[PDB]
């Protein structure tokens, strides 16, 4: 077919049927021969292409809608499925961050937004890296939703009375023999719980419903 409508109505009737393939190459071809002006067409060209693993194409298609300001919660969340699709984290997380920043508040954008830093937070906290686990889940606190503030704030609680307390474990035997670097570790223990009282109080401002987070707030108030 040359005709440019009938290639689209050809790659809706392919949609209809579930033949992504078809759908792909019938709507890409009319996207090429209309200048890329259908922002309906190229969302659904965008899926179809992610579909049968175009990935490259299907975050193409689905900027042609972004750039239109078409349907942009779902651009761009099929924009970053197609980065993830292709295993690239930095872009995957980078448009979403340009999503939340055209479409702030939007409940599905935020969530994957936070769950991606929260994620990324717990895999730093396992390895023992304090300063890019706060880095991670203090990115997830970006969010207007109060209730995903809470988790981040309240993983944020948890790391530093983790870290106050492996460095009060450590101290322990330097009681006795050596008062300087006791003195040094004991600082050190404070200012890590002081910074987990603060952030647990933020989640229970935020959540007072949440009971437990209370409740470890104020475990890590007896150690100070």
């Given at each position: 077919t040359t005709d440019p409508n009938q290639l689209k109505n050809e790659g809706n009737d392919a949609?209809?049927?579930?033949?992504?393939?078809?759908?792909?190459?019938?709507?890409?071809?009319?996207?090429?021969?209309?200048?890329?002006?259908?922002?309906?067409?190229?969302?659904?060209c965008g899926?179809?292409?992610d579909n049968i693993k175009k990935?490259?194409?299907?975050?193409?298609?689905?900027?042609?809608?972004?750039?239109?300001?078409?349907?942009?919660?779902?651009?761009?969340?099929?924009?970053s499925a197609a980065y993830r699709d292709m295993k690239n984290n930095q872009e995957y997380i980078a448009t979403l961050t340009e999503g939340i920043k055209a479409v702030p508040g939007n409940a599905t954008i935020e969530k994957l937004y936070a769950i991606y830093y929260l994620k990324e937070g717990q895999k730093f906290q396992q390895a023992g890296n304090?300063?890019?686990a706060e880095e991670n889940y203090k990115h997830a606190t970006d969010v207007t939703s109060k209730k995903w503030k809470t988790d981040a704030l309240y993983s944020l609680g948890v790391l530093f009375y983790n870290n106050g307390a492996d460095v009060l474990r450590k101290a322990t035997p330097l009681a006795s023999s050596n008062k300087e670097k006791y003195a040094s570790e004991k600082a050190k223990a404070d200012a890590a719980f002081k910074k987990a009282v603060d952030y647990?109080?933020?989640?229970?401002?935020?959540?007072?419903?949440?009971?437990?987070?209370?409740?470890?707030?104020?475990?890590v108030k007896a150690m100070i």
């Open positions: 949609l209809n049927a579930k033949n992504y393939a078809v759908a792909f190459e019938k709507y890409s071809e009319y996207l090429k021969l209309t200048n890329n002006q259908d922002s309906v067409t190229a969302y659904n899926v179809c292409a990935y490259k194409e299907a975050a193409d298609y689905f900027d042609i809608a972004i750039k239109k300001n078409y349907n942009l919660a779902n651009a761009y969340i099929g924009k304090i300063e890019k647990l109080g933020e989640a229970v401002t935020l959540s007072p419903n949440r009971t437990e987070i209370k409740q470890m707030q104020d475990q």
